[PDB]
């Protein structure tokens, strides 16, 4: 089916069609019906096969806009690099225009990112190190997080972010919906899913 056939807010559809996106890729077609209704998923898919929208869309659909100054984020996306955090934050911003998205990453100063958070955030896309930092400073509050996404989990293992990722997940409420994306499923990823997810459906589109 095309995107227009799924139960997506009109504004989200408008955003998709404007960029010539009309038909879900394999990972999106299998994941969306599950994700849209709140279920935990594990997604195995390579880069370039549309994994990003497979979680951006469900975030866009679940979260209503809010006007509350200083509000805590309701969605958390963790990525292994500053580069990927900025790409993902840009995409989420495109498909979810009703939300305030804030990217958070190392390699720069603390000032600009901290002002954005304190002013208010609906969704935070972040590398694990910089997220922990702001959590530890009482700047990033993860207690209202309704959706948590691990993007390229096997890569975060590779970058050495495991202790940090676990701490960040622990901080979110168990009431959360969890989405783990990863090309490979190393021992650490499996443990993570047993520990943080609820009866996740595994979807694999690798050749």
UniProtKB/TrEMBL annotation:
<feature type="short sequence motif" description="Q motif">
    <location>
        <begin position="1"/>
        <end position="29"/>
    </location>
</feature>
<comment type="similarity">
    <text>Belongs to the DEAD box helicase family.</text>
</comment>
<feature type="domain" description="DEAD-box RNA helicase Q">
    <location>
        <begin position="1"/>
        <end position="29"/>
    </location>
</feature>
<feature type="domain" description="Helicase ATP-binding">
    <location>
        <begin position="32"/>
        <end position="203"/>
    </location>
</feature>
<feature type="binding site">
    <location>
        <position position="49"/>
    </location>
    <ligand>
        <name>AMP</name>
    </ligand>
</feature>
<protein>
    <submittedName>
        <fullName>Heat resistant RNA dependent ATPase</fullName>
    </submittedName>
</protein>
<feature type="binding site">
    <location>
        <position position="28"/>
    </location>
    <ligand>
        <name>AMP</name>
    </ligand>
</feature>
<feature type="binding site">
    <location>
        <position position="51"/>
    </location>
    <ligand>
        <name>AMP</name>
    </ligand>
</feature>
<feature type="binding site">
    <location>
        <position position="23"/>
    </location>
    <ligand>
        <name>AMP</name>
    </ligand>
</feature>
<feature type="binding site">
    <location>
        <position position="50"/>
    </location>
    <ligand>
        <name>AMP</name>
    </ligand>
</feature>
<feature type="binding site">
    <location>
        <position position="52"/>
    </location>
    <ligand>
        <name>AMP</name>
    </ligand>
</feature>
